[PDB]
Design an enzyme around this catalytic site. Structure first.
Site, PDB file in Angstrom:
ATOM      1  N   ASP A 162      37.087  82.476  90.956  1.00  0.00           N
ATOM      2  CA  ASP A 162      36.810  81.249  91.687  1.00  0.00           C
ATOM      3  C   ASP A 162      36.073  81.575  92.977  1.00  0.00           C
ATOM      4  OD1 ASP A 162      36.648  78.688  92.598  1.00  0.00           O
ATOM      5  OD2 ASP A 162      38.808  78.346  92.786  1.00  0.00           O
ATOM      6  N   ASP A 199      42.418  79.133  93.632  1.00  0.00           N
ATOM      7  CA  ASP A 199      43.388  78.585  94.569  1.00  0.00           C
ATOM      8  C   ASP A 199      42.995  77.144  94.878  1.00  0.00           C
ATOM      9  OD1 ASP A 199      41.097  79.265  96.025  1.00  0.00           O
ATOM     10  OD2 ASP A 199      42.243  79.557  97.875  1.00  0.00           O
ATOM     11  N   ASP A 239      42.506  73.827  91.028  1.00  0.00           N
ATOM     12  CA  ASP A 239      42.870  74.730  89.941  1.00  0.00           C
ATOM     13  C   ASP A 239      44.291  74.481  89.446  1.00  0.00           C
ATOM     14  OD1 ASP A 239      40.437  76.260  89.693  1.00  0.00           O
ATOM     15  OD2 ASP A 239      40.954  77.235  91.590  1.00  0.00           O
TER      16      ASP A 239
END
Length: 967
Positions: free
Chosen positions: A406, A682, A686
């Site tokens: 991410d 995070d 998510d």
């Protein structure tokens, strides 16, 4: 998919319970495959209109379950989904008996709350608003769990053990098993306690009544067709509702009216549960007016719980192995009976000893198999890890081929600085727009601090030079990442508005206002190398604010270079594992990193679809041949399924520009091909990805916070990730090996008249438990990043061949030792009438016991994995010391007899085979076994089946082979 419903009620009462009790024993084996049970007397085959019991018959969907019907018109519960039965259509319908279609809103507008309809029917309908939240007491759950096959086996084993004159011996282990069951009960109770976190507290709200009266009632009761009231005190809205009057700021009303409801562009009126309310504008009084849509259980709040509870997820191999053990025991029972009969012992009290031996033939190496991995969680706590509350799926996640990442709110790390002036050529409008760009992510705070502004955590300083004051702000959501704020500009000259968002998002609304000519190529050239850009717009005044806007310029910023992830990616690449990332910042900010990290050597290109029109194609656009997947690309080609959708995800490199709402769908699609794909992210974008992912990774999540299934405390991820799976595989092999050995030894060492030291049975339990077998549960970092990948299956050609050779060698050496008695004094023991319990260890019992113990020790020493698999055996000082002590004490028994001979009363051994023959044979066997293991474990599977390993059902290898035809 598709199935059928059938059933029938009971005919009478008075003897059904008697029949059940009399025929209770056979019913235990009917738990699996209940299909045969429906043909018994339980089904008198009455009319289908009146059954009072719904039974699901498999027609197109497997994994049948059991359903129950209760009477408070008829209804029943199935996986938390309420079903209503009607006598007009002869069918079962969902919670929306008449709301399946999209009816007009005229009826909703013309309603006047409740009416004179009977409340009994309005309660017989789907009923109050509650959630599953099942609660059970300790004795109730204990009795309920006592019927499980896993626990029932332990009770039978201990009961048969007690019959063999073992009270202080087996009682301790039985108590250990009972306390382990208590720990399991705590495990399953903690999750139930956590489930009660999303439930709101009871509160009193106003409920409308027909005509002219208003009353207050608790939220515990509610029925369709009422005007709900949401006071400012209430934080969580009891059930889903749609605003009918006034305004809300989580929504507007519908005072103009509309025709058929589409629920596509008019989503600004519906409000869902699970979201707090910030401010509301009430036209009449301080309250609000709304409807009662899909409510109670089966709603969004309850729907998520139901989806994560009932359908939440390789036991076929374990079942096959258990069946193999059972058939082996069955076919050995006849041999054991024949051997017993050979001794001429027809006594009734002794024949049952054969059945006791059959029961004990299977060792207890099945309840106790996860003891090794428990200490690994302790190690993770000791140093670091992402351990969850109840880590139990490490082996399940042991297999993986894709690792995600991410960047929206995870990378880079905190830190940012300004580079230079804007490329428009300090500027009034630019400074004014920037001053109000704050959330008081810390990025905005850093930006405002760098630009030299001080603002309240609305009020701002430095008013004379630049008067700025925040008036109203909108919340930041997951999808449609943007931030629009209305400030108190009217004081200076006139009202103004500002908004910040990605250039792509704002490009779709500035077309009719102004389109700069140099906005595309210049932006591409500027952002082609690392730099990330956001678009700022202003409006001199959520759909109302996005009417007309004017772009004010670009924005160049750099977070950091983070020179620490690249080694991790390079190390991961060496394990034949592809690395991917998911984010929604910018495609040019993600392609640039892909060219400077270890996932693809050449330059990868990207493909962009034409538009959303049905004339989509597959053009060829440039930036070994792996393509890059963009948001709109798959978002548009999600259509026709037989277009080989599963065959293009593997070839893709990056899945970005994708709204978090589809994270769960993407994860499910990836996992549908037997590909366990983890997650590393995070923030609030998510949650679904981690919830629907078997394995998840988080960095910004601290302790004392339960949001993700795996809770943390980027570089220390792969080191603890792959090592954990490798160690789990190694320990599972360590168990299955030596478990087969214990089984065969228990089955074979019973040499007709050898009791194996009935009183000395503890000599093996306190050689296996806590000293020194279950030990060496240490971390296994080999300090190498090679392509080592042990199999995760109990069955395999190399392991099977090694085990076959091991049993062949042990049988041969045992036969040789047994025949060695011929060249020795006869010393015939006492006559019959004992057959075992006489405890007469003279020249064979203790000898075989010591030989078997030394063989177990030798196998444990030699069967250990090498350096590349696990740490050397000489690195763990405590384990080495324990092994040395055990070896020394074992040798002392055969070295010289001293004071130890008193209590145990060891008999004398002839000097002919006391120090030479036994030592020679045992050392020769040890060296031979070590050489055989070294030869077999070196390059056997590779040289055997590197090319064609009998491809039968390997799905991952199937895709691997299919990929060749696509090159």
């Amino acid at each position: 998919r598709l199935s059928g419903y059938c059933g029938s009620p009971w005919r009478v009462i008075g003897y059904h319970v008697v029949v059940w009790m009399m025929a209770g024993i056979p019913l235990l084996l009917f738990r699996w495959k209940p299909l045969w049970g429906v043909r018994l007397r339980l089904r008198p085959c009455n009319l289908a209109h009146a059954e009072t019991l719904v039974i699901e018959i498999r027609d197109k969907e497997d994994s049948s379950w059991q359903l129950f019907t209760v009477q408070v018109l008829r209804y029943y519960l199935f996986q938390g989904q309420r079903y209503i039965w009607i006598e007009t259509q002869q069918a079962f319908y969902q919670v929306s008996l008449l709301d399946h279609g999209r009816s007009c809103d005229d009826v909703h507008r013309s309603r006047h709350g409740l009416s004179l309809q009977d409340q009994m029917v309005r309660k017989a309908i789907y009923g109050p608003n509650v959630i599953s939240i099942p609660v059970k007491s300790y004795p109730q759950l204990l009795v309920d769990e006592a019927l499980n096959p896993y626990y029932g086996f332990q009770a039978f084993s201990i009961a048969l053990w007690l019959a063999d004159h073992y009270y202080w011996y087996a009682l301790c282990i039985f108590l250990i098993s009972s306390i382990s069951i208590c720990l399991s009960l705590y495990k399953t109770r903690k999750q139930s306690q956590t489930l009660r976190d999303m439930v709101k507290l009871s509160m009193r709200v106003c409920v409308c009544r027909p005509g002219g009266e208003e009353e207050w009632v608790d939220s515990s009761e509610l029925v369709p067709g009422d005007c709900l009231v949401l006071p400012q005190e209430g934080g969580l809205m009891p059930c889903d509702a749609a605003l009918v009057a006034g305004e809300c700021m989580v929504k507007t009303a519908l005072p103009e009216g509309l025709g058929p409801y589409c629920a596509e562009t008019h989503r600004r009126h519906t409000l869902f549960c699970g979201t707090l309310i910030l401010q509301a504008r009430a036209y009449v009084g301080p309250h609000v007016l709304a409807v009662v849509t899909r409510t109670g259980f089966c709603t969004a709040k309850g729907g998520l719980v139901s989806s994560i509870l009932h359908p939440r997820p390789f036991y076929k191999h374990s079942m096959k192995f258990v069946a193999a053990l059972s058939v082996l025991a069955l076919l050995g029972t006849i041999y054991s009976i024949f051997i017993l009969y050979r001794n001429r012992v027809p006594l009734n009290e002794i024949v049952i000893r054969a059945l006791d031996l059959v029961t004990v033939v299977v060792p207890p190496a099945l309840p106790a198999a996860m003891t090794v991995c428990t200490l690994y969680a302790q190690s993770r706590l000791r140093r670091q890890g992402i351990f969850c509350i109840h880590p139990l799926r490490i082996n399940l996640g042991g297999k993986l081929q894709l690792v995600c990442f991410d960047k929206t709110g995870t990378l880079t790390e905190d830190g940012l600085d300004v580079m230079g002036v804007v490329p428009l050529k300090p500027v009034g409008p630019l400074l004014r727009a920037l001053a109000t760009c704050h959330a008081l992510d810390p990025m905005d705070l850093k930006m405002v601090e760098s630009t030299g502004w001080v603002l309240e955590e609305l009020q701002a300083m430095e008013e004379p030079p630049v008067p700025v004051s925040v008036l109203h702000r909108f919340p930041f959501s997951s999808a449609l990442q943007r931030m629009s704020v209305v400030v108190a500009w009217p004081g200076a000259t006139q009202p103004e508005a500002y908004v910040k968002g990605s250039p792509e998002l704002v490009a779709g609304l500035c077309n009719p206002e102004t389109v700069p000519t140099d906005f595309a190529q210049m932006l591409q050239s500027y952002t082609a190398a690392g730099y990330r850009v956001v678009a700022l717009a202003s409006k001199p005044l959520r759909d109302t604010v996005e009417g007309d806007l004017s772009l004010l310029g670009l924005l160049v910023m750099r977070n950091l270079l983070k020179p620490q992830t690249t080694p991790v990616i390079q190390a991961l690449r060496r394990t034949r594992i592809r690395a991917v990332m998911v984010t929604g910042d910018n495609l040019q900010t993600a392609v640039t990193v892909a060219r400077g990290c270890g996932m693809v050597a050449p330059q990868e290109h990207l493909i962009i679809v034409h538009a959303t029109h049905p004339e989509r194609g597959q053009p060829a656009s440039l930036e070994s041949r792996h393509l890059a997947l963009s948001g709109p690309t798959f978002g548009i080609i999600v259509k026709h399924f037989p277009k080989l959708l599963p065959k293009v995800l593997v070839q893709g490199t990056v899945f970005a520009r994708m709204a978090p709402e589809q994270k769960t769908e993407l994860v499910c699609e990836l996992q549908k091909l037997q590909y366990c794909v983890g997650m590393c992210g995070d923030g609030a974008n998510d949650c679904g990805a981690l919830k629907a992912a078997d394995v998840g990774i988080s960095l910004s999540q601290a302790e004392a916070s339960v949001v993700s299934p795996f809770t943390s405390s980027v570089p220390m991820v792969i080191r603890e990730g792959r090592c954990s799976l490798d160690t789990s595989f190694s320990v599972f092999k360590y168990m299955a090996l030596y478990s087969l050995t214990q089984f065969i030894s228990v089955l074979i060492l019973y040499t007709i008249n050898t009791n194996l030291g009935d009183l000395q049975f503890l000599a093996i339990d306190l050689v296996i438990t806590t000293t020194v077998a279950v030990l060496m549960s240490r971390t296994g970092p080999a300090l190498v990043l090679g392509r080592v990948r042990p199999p995760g299956a109990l069955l395999s050609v190399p392991v099977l061949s090694s085990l076959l050779l091991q049993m062949v060698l042990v049988t041969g050496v045992q036969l040789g030792g047994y025949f060695l008695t011929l060249a020795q004094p006869w010393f015939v023991p006492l006559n019959r009438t004992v057959a075992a319990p006489d405890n007469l260890p003279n020249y064979e019992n203790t000898v075989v016991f010591s030989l078997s113990s030394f063989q177990y020790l030798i196998l444990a020493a030699a069967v250990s994995k090498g350096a590349p698999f696990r740490r050397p055996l000489y690195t763990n000082v405590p384990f080495l010391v324990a092994l040395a002590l055990l070896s020394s004490v074992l040798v002392g028994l055969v070295l010289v007899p001293g004071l130890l001979q008193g209590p145990l009363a060891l008999r004398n051994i002839t000097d002919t085979g006391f120090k030479l023959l036994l030592l020679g044979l045992v050392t020769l066997n040890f060296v031979g076994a070590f050489m055989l293991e070294s030869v077999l474990d070196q390059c056997l599977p590779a040289c055997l089946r590197r090319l064609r390993p009998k491809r039968a059902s390997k799905k991952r290898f199937k895709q691997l082979e299919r990929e060749l035809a696509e090159q």
